[PDB]
Amino acid sequence: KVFGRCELAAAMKRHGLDNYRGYSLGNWVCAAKFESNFNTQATNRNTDGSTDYGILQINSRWWCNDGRTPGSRNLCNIPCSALLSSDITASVNCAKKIVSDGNGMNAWVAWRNRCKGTDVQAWIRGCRL
Ligand SMILES: [Cl-]
Ligand SMILES: [Cl-]
């Protein structure tokens, strides 16, 4: 599923991401835009052979099991394929563990490079939340 901006904001808001660890909702929408273009089915392969999955491009190196990232961890205890669902619950729940791991949203390269220090509230402007 390819979400609309406001549709995704509202789904994220319902799943407790607004202000989660001090990150306002615009941060999460912005990250999703630049990570996946709001497409729950996004995959991208990293040079190390790990893969990034779903709306927030969560990496098989640490976070999920895809059966083909030898010597990786499954810290969110999920098949990576569950991150590709049109229901973003598993992505959001895993994202919460990532953002809590000490690096905040800096874990998301596109967040760091494209959202951080910008006006992120613009990403939810206009939305009925
Ligand atoms: Cl694996
Ligand atoms: Cl980037």
UniProtKB/Swiss-Prot annotation:
Residues that, per the record, bind substrate: D101
Domain C-type lysozyme: 1-129
Tissue: In the egg white and polymorphonuclear leukocytes.
Primary location group: secreted
MF (Gene Ontology): beta-N-acetylglucosaminidase activity; identical protein binding; lysozyme activity
Keyword list, A-Z: Allergen, Antimicrobial, Bacteriolytic enzyme, Disulfide bond, Glycosidase, Hydrolase, Secreted, Signal
Pfam families in the record: Lys
EC number(s) given by UniProt: 3.2.1.17
Disulfide feature: C6-C127, C30-C115, C64-C80, C76-C94
UniProt keyword annotation of Signal present: yes
Keyword Secreted: yes
GO BP terms, alphabetized: cell wall macromolecule catabolic process; defense response to bacterium; defense response to Gram-negative bacterium; defense response to Gram-positive bacterium; killing of cells of another organism
Family statement: Belongs to the glycosyl hydrolase 22 family.
Annotated function: Lysozymes have primarily a bacteriolytic function; those in tissues and body fluids are associated with the monocyte-macrophage system and enhance the activity of immunoagents. Has bacteriolytic activity against M.luteus.
Name the record gives this protein: Lysozyme C
Organism: Gallus gallus (Chicken)
